[PDB]
Amino acid sequence: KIIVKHVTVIGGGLMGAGIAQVAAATGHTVVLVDQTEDILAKSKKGIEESLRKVAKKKFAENPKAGDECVEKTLSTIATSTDAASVVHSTDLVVEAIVENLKVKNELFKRLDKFAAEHTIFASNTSSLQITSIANATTRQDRFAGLHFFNPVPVMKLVEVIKTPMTSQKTFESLVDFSKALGKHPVSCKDTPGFIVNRLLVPYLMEAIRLYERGDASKEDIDTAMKLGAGYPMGPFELLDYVGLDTTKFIVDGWHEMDAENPLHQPSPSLNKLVAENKFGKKTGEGFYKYK
Amino acid sequence: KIIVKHVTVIGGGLMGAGIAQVAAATGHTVVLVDQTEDILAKSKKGIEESLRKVAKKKFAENPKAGDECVEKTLSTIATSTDAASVVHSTDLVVEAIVENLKVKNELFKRLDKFAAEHTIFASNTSSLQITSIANATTRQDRFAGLHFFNPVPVMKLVEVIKTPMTSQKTFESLVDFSKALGKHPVSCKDTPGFIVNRLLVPYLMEAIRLYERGDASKEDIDTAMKLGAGYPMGPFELLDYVGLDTTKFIVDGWHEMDAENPLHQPSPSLNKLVAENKFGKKTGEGFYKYKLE
Ligand SMILES: C[C@H](O)CC(=O)SCCNC(=O)CCNC(=O)[C@H](O)C(C)(C)COP(=O)(O)OP(=O)(O)OC[C@H]1O[C@@H](n2cnc3c(N)ncnc32)[C@H](O)[C@@H]1OP(=O)(O)O
């Protein structure tokens, strides 16, 4: 089989860094790629901090081993500002860069010429169709979606997205990898939203619309889903959490794709917040104000 | 103000039973009403079992304390086959019977003649407008929705629905009553699905479709929502928990009001199961087969 051992993660964002961190943490040799050394420096530092916060809790009875474990994981993460040189022999390429098709297709089209033969390609994209990216290459059978959730290092779920062209061996390789990461892989076809976002996002929009109709308050709607349906967070608390701009972008993506479906109709209230840079917790204000 | 102390719950079903239980466990005098004495005995048996379950848990170390807890509560739940025979002296009526408009109105039109003036009428209906049922009486200022969630003994939420005619006084009272039950009440307009069902049911339908569409399996969709969304139950386990028939009916109703709306399009899988009398856990089988209890 194609046992993934060496992994190339392109993108130093929280997602990219999280994926690198878990892979590093489970015995994989990792190479994190990005545009500048400064970015890489920060991202890796981010991983270092995250890794220590956990070690100070698990290795409280023996801090020596803790620092060891942390050092061993950091050193298994390498950095580079040139993907082409790195992917010449990597087993897997996981992409987690800006959510723009053009940009993504250039990268992979390029990497598809330097990457080894067996190299599997996979995107972590939330607002695009895997198939649209895989066709920017000729490695389609080795192209798939590998969708994670934030905080990557904590969230055990990973959606192994298989396209009609994706190989069966490719699928099984990503399923075994996901487990090797200590994750729980679920399967899904290259359909907009896959499983989680497909069922979670529209619901959130629905909650926003119910509020705009004047039928209930955001507070009561939140109390309602927590106490009535046993949810961790009400839809509004959750929106601020996952990011209002992040949500808007994804919905607009489906909206533009299917202008008729009423489920993807824009929300004036959502749009307003986004326009006036009120993205949620990551700006101290979304539907609610923070800190 | 008039504080609710005496409550008349109509419907020995799982919902009514639960409402009676929580009401009685929180110091309210309760009368549970259903068609026969055997039905009532069966319903009250389920309540007792649910109570000894809560007791041998809160008093896992003191059986005697657990017995008294159960006894006191259980002795404040009286049973009658004709609500008209008790409402003349009750403060609140909570109806949770067949989701049939004619049967509900018939019930309230009659009780509206035996009930004391202050008595408030409330329906736990999930698929009807509270306004529809209210206009079957001359007590609309004292009529409202009081919607609970399964499992009633556990879910803290209670939706207090106010129709354009519900007086503020009637509202505040149901609000205080909700808190007295140890629940947290939230307000909502009298719109289909109110708050929770309006956001939960459609979501549940979407999951069935993603499945029917062949995109993902039931098993993985449940795993995904539990791990990725943190829900206590995947959409299929929940469906099987609230009842497939129970769900279908509420959706058929919404579809019936807006056939053009996609959100309510019927589901072949759901319909087929209901036609096979596989309603979920109730019957030991819904989307999944459950080992008979
Ligand atoms: C259709 C309508 O109109 C309205 C509706 O009902 S919409 C649907 C609303 N309901 C929901 O959304 C269901 C979501 N699920 C839930 O919130 C939870 O899964 C749950 C409350 C059923 C409990 O889940 P779970 O963690 O698995 O608990 P469970 O294994 O069943 O039992 C353990 C706990 O639950 C309690 N419990 C569950 N059902 C109980 C019952 N019927 N009676 C007494 N206790 C019960 C136990 O006392 C216990 O407490 P413990 O942890 O301290 O020991």
Swiss-Prot record, chain B:
CoA binds at residues 50, 57, 126. Optimum at neutral pH. It catalyses: a (3S)-3-hydroxyacyl-CoA + NAD(+) = a 3-oxoacyl-CoA + NADH + H(+); (3S)-3-hydroxybutanoyl-CoA + NAD(+) = acetoacetyl-CoA + NADH + H(+); (3S)-hydroxydecanoyl-CoA + NAD(+) = 3-oxodecanoyl-CoA + NADH + H(+); (3S)-hydroxyhexadecanoyl-CoA + NAD(+) = 3-oxohexadecanoyl-CoA + NADH + H(+). The keyword Lipid metabolism applies. Keywords: Acetylation, Differentiation, Disease variant, Fatty acid metabolism, Hydroxylation, Lipid metabolism, Mitochondrion, NAD, Oxidoreductase, Spermatogenesis, Transferase, Transit peptide. Signal peptide: none annotated. Its EC number is 1.1.1.35. One of its GO terms (cellular component) is mitochondrion. This is Hydroxyacyl-coenzyme A dehydrogenase, mitochondrial. The lineage of its organism: Eukaryota, Metazoa, Chordata, Craniata, Vertebrata. The gene is HADH.
